[PDB]
């Protein structure tokens, strides 16, 4: 896949995972009002996907 | 192991497996007698393993 992976499927990536619910904006040495505010502003993204995605199933085995 | 294999890995290679027990000289276009003539002149090789080598245990399992 190095060297294959397509500018369409990183815009996929982004369009479908940074969304406001897959999301957590975290501050150090900001003020609360000001996280809010840009998270309010510029971090309201939806239409992705939603769940913690396909449910990881175990299987088991042996890699050499 | 590209590289890393060695002279003496060779060696010790021919001289534990092509000897006399663990090999056949068949002829085409040839008489008996002179196949028989060079088995007995310079295929007289000893001093190498035995049996079919370590019996191959089969396990079992899934590569991807």
Do not use: M, S
């Given at each position: 896949?190095?060297?294959?992976?397509?500018?369409?499927?990183?815009?996929?990536?982004?369009?479908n995972h940074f969304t406001s619910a897959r999301m957590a904006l975290i501050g150090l040495g900001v003020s609360h009002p000001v996280l809010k505010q840009v998270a309010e502003q510029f971090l309201n993204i939806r239409g992705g996907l939603g769940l913690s995605g396909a449910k990881a199933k175990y299987h088991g085995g042996e890699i050499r």
């Open positions: 896949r190095i060297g294959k992976v397509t500018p369409v499927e990183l815009h996929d990536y982004v369009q």
